[PDB]
């Protein structure tokens, strides 16, 4: 059975709620597995404490940038920028978890929540898992973002991890 991981989410600092999401372990393992651990942060580092500087509404919510917090750093926890593992999946509606990216084989740990069918995506961004438990909390995020995705209040990853 695939991996379920969560994101508890606060907005400047108090408690919106919990996320939780089913990564794709099945057919991207290794994008699933940065995920995963970065999630747990099973490795020393991660998501824990980090925020989504970027939100725009009809499209998605940007995080996982836990280095620099503003969306030009982020690392995987395979010491380098890592493939695009394969394209099985498509950007099908709301919830969807896929890979950003700076192009073809340069993901790090960035990834976004999809607010909409992303078709946009397609070939280009590799998905790989998708909200289990929690969509009117990505919902309620989506309101604090506008143009370009700039965010009216600092939304963050207050604690995460694995569930069993």
């Known amino acids: 059975?695939?991996?379920?991981?969560?994101?508890?989410?606060?907005?400047?600092?108090?408690?919106?709620?919990?996320?939780?999401?089913?990564?794709?372990?099945?057919?991207?393992?290794?994008?699933?597995?940065?995920?995963?651990?970065?999630?747990?942060?099973?490795?020393?580092?991660?998501?824990?404490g980090s925020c989504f500087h970027r939100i725009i509404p009809g499209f998605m919510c940007q995080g996982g940038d836990f280095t620099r917090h503003n969306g030009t750093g982020g690392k995987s926890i395979y010491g380098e920028?890592?493939?695009?593992?394969?394209?099985?999946?498509?950007?099908?509606?709301?919830?969807?978890?896929?890979?950003?990216?700076?192009?073809?084989?340069?993901?790090?740990?960035?990834?976004?929540?999809?607010?909409?069918?992303t078709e946009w995506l397609d070939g280009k961004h590799v998905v790989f898992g998708k909200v289990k438990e929690g969509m009117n909390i990505v919902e309620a995020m989506e309101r604090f973002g506008s143009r370009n995705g700039k965010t009216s209040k600092k939304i963050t990853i207050a604690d995460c991890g694995q569930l069993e």
């Open 81 to 117: 920028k890592f493939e695009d593992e394969n394209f099985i999946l498509k950007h099908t509606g709301p919830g969807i978890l896929t890979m950003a990216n700076a192009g073809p084989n340069t993901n790090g740990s960035q990834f976004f929540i999809c607010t909409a069918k």
């Open 1 to 48: 059975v695939n991996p379920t991981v969560f994101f508890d989410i606060a907005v400047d600092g108090e408690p919106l709620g919990r996320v939780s999401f089913e990564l794709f372990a099945d057919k991207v393992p290794k994008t699933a597995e940065n995920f995963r651990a970065l999630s747990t942060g099973e490795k020393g580092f991660g998501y824990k």
